[PDB]
Chains A and B, each alone.
Chain A
Amino acid sequence: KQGIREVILCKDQDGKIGLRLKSIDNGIFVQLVQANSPASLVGLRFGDQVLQINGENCAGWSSDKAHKVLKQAFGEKITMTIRDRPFERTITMHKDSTGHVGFIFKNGKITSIVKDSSAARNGLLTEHNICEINGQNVIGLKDSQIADILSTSGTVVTITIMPAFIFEHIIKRMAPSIMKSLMDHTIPEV
């Protein structure tokens, strides 16, 4: 049970739950959750791992397979087993007299730590993407937007981070396989 819960969702009026999933290392992960969706209401988050859908194990499923199963799910009612944000970690820092915690970032990724800052003391790492600051999601925001959130924060700055190589793999959108097939499997029948 640790870090794992079972949820029940119901498709909305349009037959949707508000997800895009992605196959990574023989698991299925949440790539996108739509705001004000069935999926958002049961607390699905970017980077969550989906272990089962409607009693079936997701292990080894392609993105296409997972989407197909949800699309073709006969019930209004859908069960999922979720492992919550496995690749995220939380770091809490405190602003100095200039209002800073001590790290340099670009494109949402931490690239340098200032020695003897709060970030240093708390062991913040580079090559990590910021996911949330003080409860506000920053995935997809511009650096100026991130800067504004940090600026307006109080002294206590609690961030979640994820290794950049994992983040990039989860967020990266694949071509339709439709196209990948067309281009991969070019073998004439006759």
Chain B
Amino acid sequence: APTNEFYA
């Protein structure tokens, strides 16, 4: 699973 992503 993706991790430590950023929300814009």
Tell me the A residues contacting B by CB distance below 8 Å. Answer: 100-106, 111-112, 119, 143, 146-147, 150, 157
22 pairs, CB–CB < 8 Å, chain A vs chain B: A100-B8, A101-B8, A102-B8, A103-B8, A104-B2, A104-B5, A104-B6, A104-B7, A105-B5, A106-B2, A106-B5, A106-B6, A111-B2, A111-B5, A112-B2, A112-B5, A119-B8, A143-B6, A147-B6, A147-B8, A150-B8, A157-B8
A143 nearest in chain B by CB position: B6
Question: How far is A157 from B8 in the complex, measured between Cα atoms in Å?
Answer: 10
Do B2 and A100 have beta carbons less than 8 Å apart?
Answer: no
Bin chain B's interface residue count.
under 10
Main secondary structure of the interface of B (DSSP, over half): loop
Distance of A28 from chain B, by nearest CB (Å):
33
A102 to B8 CA separation, bound complex (whole angstroms): 6
B8 x A104 contact (CB < 8 A): yes
Residues of B close to A102: CB separation below 8 A: 8
Set of chain B residues within 8 Å of A157, measured between Cβ atoms: 8
**Cβ-closest 8 pairs across A and B:** A106-B5, A104-B5, A150-B8, A143-B6, A103-B8, A147-B6, A105-B6, A104-B7
9 new A-B contacts at CB < 8 Å, known A105-B8, A119-B8, A150-B8? A100-B8, A102-B8, A103-B8, A104-B2, A104-B5, A106-B4, A106-B6, A146-B8, A147-B6
Contacts of B2 in A (CB 8 A): 104, 106, 111-112
- Determine the residue in chain B with the shortest Cβ distance to A133: B8
